[PDB]
């Protein structure tokens, strides 16, 4: 029998006290006669999905709730229908962690959350608000002791501050998660990350702090506060640093919202012992006696059962973990969280380091997070042009600042190329024309010349919706289809021209003009029947001499001396008019 009827097989991980479970299973055999065998295979997170689909799994699983959402999406978990009396015996917020499609899919067993850990360096009135942390810093800075230190590289530790004023991963309602509503780049999230970066700017915290660096500083007494979970209590314990666990600080009067991970017990949909499994979990495991047996083998932290939680809350550390969990955000059980972790991790690092602004980092994060949420893949294939451009900014923040977008009067690479191509309207205007060809070729040429071929092909292909279009075809039904291949081909000739020793925009603009005159650049043309064909088009010698003369009198911005001197003197007027106004306050010679 793929799953033997008349006995229960339980799969739990090896770090959660698998021997206490079997003792509860012993009492089950004593009173019922149904054998309970507890096994702890490795790769249990990945073993069950394969065996369940073919129907060869275990009867019961113990694992975190975040993975169970994908299981039910594969139809591998049976619906849990508890009675009202038993359902009220467990904390209501724990049931919301095991709900998919509005239907209960598992039993909550335990709860885990991030919490604040302090030292006698500040034991008294530990900070209750995030806003007073910078003030206490100096106080200890004097004693030459840091104030707060927690890991900043991983978003799991930085999310509680970001989410407080309004921030989430995916919206939750009626037991369902909406993959199209993400909480990055909202007003509260921007405020939360801005406070984090402002602490770094004011040198209350260093952005390169690791998990190990934060752990070492607190264990050695060098920092008064750290943010971490119950897994690190053992290493701190050993260290005589006198540590207590309390509430996470409040931001803007609203509590921090750490991600909450609830240990859950599910039932295989292929198990013929569903009713026997429910009796074991409801009447034996999720009791004060049964949970104590598991608690003794491994501490199990805070517990969903209110009766045992109130007993376990006598330890202030466990009570604080439950309190932060109740104030926190249940980590979504949908598999689309893979998008959230990738986008948020890079955005937070870029903003904290200063390589990217908070608003731009979160905007690119939300753009990328929603994109990967669809297509269910961390792969970029088939994504939109906007998504890949945002992904490019997260991966290469500083370079994306230099490769800007068209802004009137800006001196970035993207706008300077437009100034070269649109000089005196010499080049033909419009999509699929001479001006567009010169822009793309010069734009790719300079990026290649200063950053490399692979950085240029990434940004060039990102701006195109389908960068893998067969370039052999030259006939297109729509001009938009034609212009896509025109840009792809003209990007290639630009990268070849740019793989040289570094030069300026002006001298690189001369190269594109030379090739445009003698070799030509791709341009769209409409034949009869409405179809569009593309071929390399040479430029008239006038156009060539007109632009070359102006290019030879210009800087690397695309402007002549007169055009630059107008702006420089205009800015001098603005700069010096303010100076004269300031000279009113302190009476000067002028």
Curated annotation (Swiss-Prot):
Induction: Induced by maltose and the transcriptional regulator MalT. Permanently repressed by cold shock in a PNPase-dependent fashion. Gene3D superfamilies: Periplasmic binding protein-like II (3.40.190.10). Pfam families: SBP_bac_1. Keywords: Periplasm, Signal, Sugar transport, Transport. Coiled coil: none annotated. One of its GO terms (cellular component) is periplasmic space. One of its GO terms (biological process) is carbohydrate transport. InterPro entries: Maltose/Cyclodextrin-bd, SBP, SBP_1_CS. It is found in: Periplasm. One of its GO terms (molecular function) is maltose binding. Belongs to the bacterial solute-binding protein 1 family. The complex is composed of two ATP-binding proteins (MalK), two transmembrane proteins (MalG and MalF) and a solute-binding protein (MalE). Part of the ABC transporter complex MalEFGK involved in maltose/maltodextrin import. Binds maltose and higher maltodextrins such as maltotriose. This is Maltose/maltodextrin-binding periplasmic protein. It comes from Escherichia coli (strain K12). The lineage of its organism: Bacteria, Pseudomonadati, Pseudomonadota, Gammaproteobacteria, Enterobacterales.
